[PDB]
Amino acid sequence: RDYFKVINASQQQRFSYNPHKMQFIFVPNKKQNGLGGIAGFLPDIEDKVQMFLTRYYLTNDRVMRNENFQMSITPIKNLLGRDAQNFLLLGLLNKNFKGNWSLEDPSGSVEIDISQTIPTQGHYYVPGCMVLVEGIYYSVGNKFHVTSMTLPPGERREITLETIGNLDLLGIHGISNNNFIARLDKDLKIRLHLLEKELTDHKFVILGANLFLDDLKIMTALSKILQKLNDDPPTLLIWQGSFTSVPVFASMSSRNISSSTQFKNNFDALATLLSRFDNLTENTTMIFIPGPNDLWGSMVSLGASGTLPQDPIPSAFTKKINKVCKNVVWSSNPTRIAYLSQEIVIFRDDLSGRFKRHRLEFPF
């Protein structure tokens, strides 16, 4: 099947958000207009200044589009001159330099009183999350005594889309750029009808995480899986997780096999195993997504969490898989595919432990 695309975080189009015009603004990509032959991938200094501004602006718009909210929130800086009055506000949640709980807004920041807080259950209240706070200001100190707390509500796809009609964000039919802005809804229903048929024939199957290509048991199980699968090749096949059980890094000894050479060797055997499943190699495209401790990250992260827009698998260590198979694509850890009428995103990392270890504590 044609008319579907897979895209990585590297080639995603840039669109800024303007709070004074309440509209998304296209941003030219540095590669297309710039030279890019020396160093074009290095972001500018003000980018990190404006990143949190952009996130806050988007969250503010999303909150204010809600049906219930038409009471109105108040910016933080407008809380200096009043006391013993209830308010409502939202912003970043973090720890101040002193070590207290604070809410940060583009206007300013305040302190938080937690001794009598009743939070809305069902949320992982974590530092770095937009939160809605209802409380009473007190000018005797600087404590905003909180009595209730809840995360903002969400919206479905169609309602958020119609606010910009149907903008060409993941543009496959057409794209927008600096000169013009483009939209399309005529072929959406046609492609929906097309997708409604022969969808059972276009199946895509995914595997588990961290399939280490060094141990014998994983290879045997994978061989059995491919034995069952080669008869009926799917449309897309995805392997997620790390492909090596030990992070690759500097080897201080030259007596033994270099870890980089071992990493190269592990994928070479996979090419050999592909030789006995020719139907799968011939009919199904292949997708590989890097794991936490693969080549580039583990070089500096040593298996720990690092930069999220992770680089793809280097070409120099995949010079045989590309030649055996006919359709293999390496993408970033967050990757987006564009189907006929579906948007699919894949993201591999650790979530439950992170949210469990950093849960905020509520006295009661």
Binding site: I38, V49, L53, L92, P106, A250, S251, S254, S315, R357
Partner: protein, 472 residues
């Protein structure tokens, strides 16, 4: 908890650079070269509020274990000796189990403090530190004759050894310097005697190590060599004459009067010939400016750099400035230039790319290797033991350095332009005072660093590093 990313851990992981001391100049006093060994073991054995501190109990236990190993190795145990030798390599290597980066940083910090304390102790007596490192120390001696420094050097080293904090150090004297022209680790020339003998005049040999010579035109390097030899001879002659007679020192003053007129006539002849034969096609070979890794200056007239280097080498006197300046102005008058012009300013004809904590498996030698300034046939082999290095290891180390550099740039802090206070809020347009945010790590610095990585990778055969570049 160790799986999470934390800033202080990130900064202690990549804090691998080691400082050094270099004091350029021309010295007429004798200078001795010494080597320092067993530094890490002596540093370890000698010596709530802070969260970055390593556990005290484990440190004490390790110190006691090392002390008993030292004692057992003293009583003719080869295994204990091998263990003592391999302890440092175990400490540095992350592949070993029970490895903590905090302990490595603690050892590095203690080594820093011990080295600065040793430098201070050497400075307590009459001494001037010319160069410093983890392996080499050069000390300026007060006296003028190498024959007179025998008892002095022996007493000094004995007193250093008897110091309780320097009890376990191993000190060796390698060379004695008669007259030195020191400006850099890789660029010096002087007269040296290996070791002082008795009742006989010592053997003096001349050394000439100058990377700056490589960046000259092919036809002027012989002239540079000859004139360096002549000026060294003149300085030796004037020092000998002054010593025979008995911040200025008459040991060297008046040395340029020997070779002024021949130098001027030769410069005039060179200028005339260059003017005559610069545009000829068959003579275009010898005027080609060579290209080397780390070269960044783009300049046209070769004779200008020849005379600029030949004057900058003399200007290092720090005591005969005026005579050198008069000679330089007279030389520049041959050209149609002026004394303080920009084009008549000397610069470093090469950049630097240093890899710290490079280890040799066969010899357990630790040194920082420079990929740009260092000459060939030394990157590939260890200094003490003449064993070839693995190349994919070099490529991997370069890649790791580059990636750590990029990460450090990406995790930098923000500083206000007017008042240098640091940013303390997640979202804010500017400082409460006047001024706009600027980054602690400027962009052009990392751009130049990547440029020199490109040049280095292009010069030699480095394919995986090229692939690492390509993915960007």
């Amino acid at each position: 908890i160790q799986n999470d990313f934390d800033l202080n851990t990130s900064w202690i992981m990549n804090d691998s650079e080691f400082p050094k001391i270099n004091n350029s100049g021309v010295y007429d006093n004798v200078v001795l070269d010494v080597g320092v060994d067993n530094l890490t073991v002596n540093t370890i054995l000698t010596s709530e509020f802070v969260h970055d501190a390593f556990s005290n109990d484990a440190l004490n236990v390790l110190r006691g274990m090392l002390k008993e190993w030292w004692d057992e190795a003293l009583k003719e145990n080869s295994t204990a000796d091998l263990l003592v030798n391999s302890l440092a390599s175990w400490v540095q290597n992350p592949n070993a189990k029970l490895f903590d980066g905090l302990l490595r940083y603690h050892v590095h910090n203690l080594t820093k403090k011990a080295l600065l304390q040793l430098v201070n102790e050497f400075s307590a007596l009459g001494s001037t530190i010319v160069y410093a490192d983890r392996n080499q120390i050069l000390i300026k001696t007060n006296k003028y004759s190498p024959e007179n420094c025998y008892a002095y050097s022996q007493y000094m080293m004995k007193a250093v050894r008897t110091n309780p904090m320097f009890s376990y150090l191993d000190l060796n004297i390698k060379r004695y310097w008669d007259l030195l022209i020191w400006m850099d680790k890789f660029n010096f020339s002087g007269l040296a005697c290996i070791e002082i003998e008795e009742k006989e005049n010592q053997d003096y040999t001349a050394v000439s190590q100058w990377q700056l010579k490589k960046f000259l035109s092919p036809i002027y390097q012989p002239e540079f060599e000859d004139w360096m030899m002549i000026i060294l001879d003149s300085m030796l002659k004037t020092k000998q004459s002054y010593l025979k007679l008995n911040s200025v020192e008459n040991s060297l003053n008046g040395f340029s009067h020997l070779f002024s007129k021949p130098l001027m006539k030769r410069v005039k002849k060179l200028f005339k010939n260059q003017q005559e034969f610069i545009l000829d096609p068959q003579y275009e070979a010898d005027y080609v400016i060579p290209v080397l890794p780390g070269s960044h200056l783009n300049v046209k007239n070769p004779l200008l750099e020849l005379v600029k280097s030949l004057c900058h080498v003399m200007l290092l006197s720090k005591s005969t400035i005026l005579e050198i300046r008069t000679l330089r102005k007279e030389l520049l008058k041959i050209f149609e230039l002026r004394e303080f012009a920009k084009v008549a300013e000397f610069k470093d004809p090469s950049l630097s790319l240093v890899v710290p904590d490079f280890l040799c498996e066969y010899c357990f030698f630790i040194s920082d290797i420079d990929f740009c300034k260092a000459a060939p046939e030394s990157i590939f082999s260890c200094v003490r033991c003449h064993k070839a290095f693995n190349q994919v290891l070099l490529q991997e180390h370069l890649i790791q350095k580059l990636r750590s550099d990029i990460e450090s740039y990406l995790i930098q802090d923000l500083r206000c332009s007017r008042c240098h206070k640091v940013k303390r809020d997640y979202m804010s347009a500017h400082c409460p005072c006047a001024g706009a945010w600027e980054g602690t790590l400027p962009r052009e610095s990392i751009v130049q660093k990547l440029n020199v990585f490109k040049q280095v990778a292009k010069y030699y055969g480095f394919d995986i590093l090229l692939s690492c570049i390509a993915d960007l």
